[PDB]
Amino acid sequence: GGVLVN
Amino acid sequence: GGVLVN
Amino acid sequence: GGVLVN
Amino acid sequence: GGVLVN
Amino acid sequence: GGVLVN
Amino acid sequence: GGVLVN
Ligand SMILES: [Zn+2]
Ligand SMILES: [Zn+2]
Ligand SMILES: [Zn+2]
Ligand SMILES: [Zn+2]
Ligand SMILES: [Zn+2]
Ligand SMILES: [Zn+2]
């Protein structure tokens, strides 16, 4: 899956 | 905010 | 699954 | 914000 | 923000 | 998956 740390 | 379409 | 830390 | 389309 | 189309 | 650190 994707990981987005905004 | 962030947008994650997995 | 995806991980979003906003 | 960031956009991630995985 | 960044845009990542994976 | 992709990793976006924004
Ligand atoms: Zn993953
Ligand atoms: Zn936003
Ligand atoms: Zn996952
Ligand atoms: Zn943005
Ligand atoms: Zn931008
Ligand atoms: Zn990966």
Side-chain angles (χ1 to χ4, degrees):
Chain A
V3 179
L4 204 191
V5 184
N6 189 57
Chain B
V3 179
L4 204 191
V5 184
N6 189 57
Chain C
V3 179
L4 204 191
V5 184
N6 189 57
Chain D
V3 179
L4 204 191
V5 184
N6 189 57
Chain E
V3 179
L4 204 191
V5 184
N6 189 57
Chain F
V3 179
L4 204 191
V5 184
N6 189 57

